[PDB]
Amino acid sequence: SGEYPTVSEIPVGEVRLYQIADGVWSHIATQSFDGAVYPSNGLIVRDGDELLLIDTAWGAKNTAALLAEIEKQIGLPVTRAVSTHFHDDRVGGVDVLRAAGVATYASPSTRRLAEVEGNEIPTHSLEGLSSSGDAVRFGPVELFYPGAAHSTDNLVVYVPSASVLYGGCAIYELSRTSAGNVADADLAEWPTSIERIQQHYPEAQFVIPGHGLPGGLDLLKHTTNVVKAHTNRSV
Numbered sequence: 001s002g003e004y005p006t007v008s009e010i011p012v013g014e015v016r017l018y019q020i021a022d023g024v025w026s027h028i029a030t031q032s033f034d035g036a037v038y039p040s041n042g043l044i045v046r047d048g049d050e051l052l053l054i055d056t057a058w059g060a061k062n063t064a065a066l067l068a069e070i071e072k073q074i075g076l077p078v079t080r081a082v083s084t085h086f087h088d089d090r091v092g093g094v095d096v097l098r099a100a101g102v103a104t105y106a107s108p109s110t111r112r113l114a115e116v117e118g119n120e121i122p123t124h125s126l127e128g129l130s131s132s133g134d135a136v137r138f139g140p141v142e143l144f145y146p147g148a149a150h151s152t153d154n155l156v157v158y159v160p161s162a163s164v165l166y167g168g169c170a171i172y173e174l175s176r177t178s179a180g181n182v183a184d185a186d187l188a189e190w191p192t193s194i195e196r197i198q199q200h201y202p203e204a205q206f207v208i209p210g211h212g213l214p215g216g217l218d219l220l221k222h223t224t225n226v227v228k229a230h231t232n233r234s235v
């Protein structure tokens, strides 16, 4: 993915798409906060003549830009969206999606945590994902709950036609060698949850982190290394 869009190349408010395979793209957007600029990834998966969106692009502004970029580059309607955890980097644009007629989804756990946090709440509930190891089909992807990691509710998404594993914020890019936002993380369980992902999707060829550059399954071991090191940086 030498051409993969990087954080320093995208102005805040703009969205890039990157086609991974036939009918599979990532979306990349940047936002500035806490003194820095960060990239964020989501996924777009074609299903017939419609699109499934995985995660919004930061907030409302970026998510409007996302819908506009999808229209320009793909030109098919986004009919459903799934948010992979309750934080604003995953649900921040949910009301923009709802206003545009997109049916928004998340697990009951995500919906609950979003409400508590004061974050936008996806409309529909995804059933069958409440116990670690649970997997359910959703249109052209499989949704998997690996257990608590970056957050207690984090989901991962696999596209079996393309061998694409979207890890969300439970998986770090290689360039990140220190913990990111871990305020809601379960450090004790995070490596076990990663092990479940490895065991369930060992065939994955293209692994996309919540933020930054894609790679292969090596990203999973990398993330475990970072998480364990952070766990030991305690006192």
Ligand SMILES: O=C(CSc1nnc(-c2ccccc2C(=O)O)[nH]1)Nc1nc2ccccc2s1
Pocket: 031, 032, 033, 038, 058, 059, 087, 088, 089, 090, 092, 150, 169, 179, 180, 181, 182, 210, 211
């Ligand atoms: O979503 C959160 C906090 S929870 C969270 N979940 N993931 C992150 C994250 C962020 C940057 C780099 C790495 C990570 C990570 O996954 O570790 N943070 N803050 C947001 N601030 C803004 C401001 C503007 C518009 C949208 C948003 S969303």
Ligand SMILES: [Cl-]
Pocket: 086, 087, 088, 089, 117, 119
């Ligand atoms: Cl948040």
Ligand SMILES: [Cl-]
Pocket: 102, 103, 104, 123
């Ligand atoms: Cl709806």
Ligand SMILES: [Cl-]
Pocket: 103
């Ligand atoms: Cl609906």
Ligand SMILES: [Zn+2]
Pocket: 085, 087, 089, 150, 151, 169, 181
């Ligand atoms: Zn998060």
Ligand SMILES: [Zn+2]
Pocket: 103, 123, 124
């Ligand atoms: Zn609906």
Ligand SMILES: [Zn+2]
Pocket: 089, 169, 210, 211
């Ligand atoms: Zn994140």
